Scaffold this active site. Structure first.
Site, PDB file in Angstrom:
ATOM      1  CG  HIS A 104      -0.412   0.192   2.524  1.00 31.42           C
ATOM      2  ND1 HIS A 104      -0.458  -0.794   3.485  1.00 31.42           N
ATOM      3  CD2 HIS A 104       0.204   1.251   3.101  1.00 31.42           C
ATOM      4  CE1 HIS A 104       0.122  -0.357   4.591  1.00 31.42           C
ATOM      5  NE2 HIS A 104       0.536   0.878   4.383  1.00 31.42           N
ATOM      6  N   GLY A 116       3.106   6.307   9.625  1.00 34.86           N
ATOM      7  CA  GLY A 116       4.438   6.233   9.067  1.00 34.86           C
ATOM      8  C   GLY A 116       5.229   5.008   9.479  1.00 34.86           C
ATOM      9  CB  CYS A 172       3.195   0.982   7.072  1.00 33.99           C
ATOM     10  SG  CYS A 172       1.640   1.371   7.800  1.00 33.99           S
TER      11      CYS A 172
END
Lengths: 306, 306
Positions: free
Chosen positions: B41, B143, B145
């Site tokens: 993503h 942030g 991820c």
């Protein structure tokens, strides 16, 4: 969201740990520039530890009696000196992995990360607080002496602790990196009693603010209080008294959450008197005091380091 | 002595974190050999996340739309492919700091360390367990991820987790390093409910053994039980059932302490029914289930790593 007891990343310190041997004693050392720091009781046998005369034991040692090993890299000791309770061993090679660093002496209530090591090799990392009686509640086995505690500020490592001793009660004592013990302890195997282990009130308040930020609000009550009225209650429960300096340090958390420091104090006061009644706060059934106000801000803001 | 929630030393993983940017989205990637792994993503905007068609979004991207930054080192992307929910970006430079590593898919109840990162830079390290409902109770902000979970075996890093999502309930979900989610979750911003978060019984038992090893023995009682009688009680309290495999895994702790696994079960059974009555175990007022039997042995034996 979420809240964890988070340690600093340890890579900068891992590259500084070495093994120090003198005679039959092996422990950990910290290799920075061309100096290795280690606990001076590396020169002791187990029998010496009951009543060591360090100056007299040190007379019988030469540079070549200290074996310093980094992985398999073998460092040559070219000078040695005793500074308070630490040995400084001058070696012929500067550590190529030396970070930007500083030595700091911390105050009770402050937190740091410990890199537990055995034979110069890292075993694990955990976060802890210096207790108000100058002990730490660590996890240390035989051979862990010389493991260090540290904080990080962007690209600079602040070394604040070196492990020396386990007291007969099972708590841990050690020095700053200049060799001065925290508290009244000495590097001798003898009964030494610590004082009362009080709760670090300003840290509890910081953690209650963290709880509110993360959605745990059930303990917020309808009361307020004063500093004198709160401190009267706190001291009955072996809590450290709160000062105006502590109120100031908490200002940014009060601003972010809209809850005045004294209102949070009244919430804490009712928790001390009534207990938590089977409920939890941030997954704990006790009031947690190993997060400083700065730790909470750092974790809730996502601060990073080199 | 002492017992701490200890994380693995993070240095080997620190040297593998990079920043990955695609359009306006920036998250973390894992740089091993000449491949960068990151959550797919990264190609989404915040609006795309409500209903993403990843294959269709990926069509509009070329190698040069992915910016990979290691410190200031800038890596050239020469190939990209989507494997389940992770992007594999082939870069022109092999990571000189690549450790010996393996990809493993863990089972619920197993523990690992998370290196929380932002913009490719480490923020902290903590230990956690994969819950039986395939979530983790992490500490992650926007942030984070692409931050990874890992274990270490001497000199080999086993990567087991990559962070992808925060559920509306505040718990965290992610994939193994082959891109397969743990549990039934998908990388879409939509209501997804987790199942019951049960307690990991075999871990609680391991931690009770750790308590005995460290001198906390007050909860040891005079009763014994059977596996079927214990499991009848456990399931009423949302505890995972204990199997013969779990009894086997606990054998070394029973041998060291002299307390049979079923005797420890009877002690636990009385703790579930009567509570802890204001007492603590290893400094906790709740039964802790984030230590596996192997974690306890490792910490109580002083195992080290490369």
């Amino acid at each position: 969201s979420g809240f964890r007891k988070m340690a600093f990343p340890s890579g900068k310190v891992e590259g500084c740990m070495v093994q120090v041997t003198c005679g039959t004693t092996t422990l950990n050392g910290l290799w920075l520039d061309d100096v290795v720091y280690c606990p001076r009781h590396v020169i002791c046998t187990s029998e010496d530890m009951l009543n060591p005369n360090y100056e007299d034991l040190l007379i019988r040692k030469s540079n070549h009696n200290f074996l310093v090993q980094a992985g398999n890299v073998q460092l040559r000791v070219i000078g040695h000196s005793m500074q308070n309770c630490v040995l400084k061993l001058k070696v012929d090679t500067a550590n190529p992995k030396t970070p930007k660093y500083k030595f700091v002496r911390i105050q009770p209530g402050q937190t740091f990360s410990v890199l537990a090591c055995y034979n110069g090799s890292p075993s694990g990392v955990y976060q802890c607080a210096m207790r108000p009686n100058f002990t730490i509640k660590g996890s240390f086995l035989n051979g862990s002496c010389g493991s260090v505690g540290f904080n990080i500020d962007y690209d600079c490592v602040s070394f604040c602790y070196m492990h020396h001793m386990e007291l007969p009660t099972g708590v841990h004592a050690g020095t700053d990196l200049e060799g001065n013990f925290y508290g009244p302890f000495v590097d001798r195997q003898t009964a030494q009693a610590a004082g009362t282990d009080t709760t670090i009130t300003v840290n509890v308040l910081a953690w209650l603010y963290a709880a509110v930020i993360n959605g745990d609000r059930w303990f917020l009550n309808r009361f307020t209080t004063t500093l004198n009225d709160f401190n009267l209650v706190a001291m009955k429960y072996n809590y450290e008294p709160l000062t105006q300096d502590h109120v100031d340090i908490l200002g940014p958390l009060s601003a972010q959450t809209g809850i005045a420091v004294l209102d949070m104090c009244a919430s804490l006061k009712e928790l001390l008197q009534n207990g938590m009644n089977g409920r939890t706060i941030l997954g704990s059934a006790l009031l947690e005091d190993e997060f400083t106000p700065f730790d909470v801000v750092r974790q809730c803001s996502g601060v990073t380091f080199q």
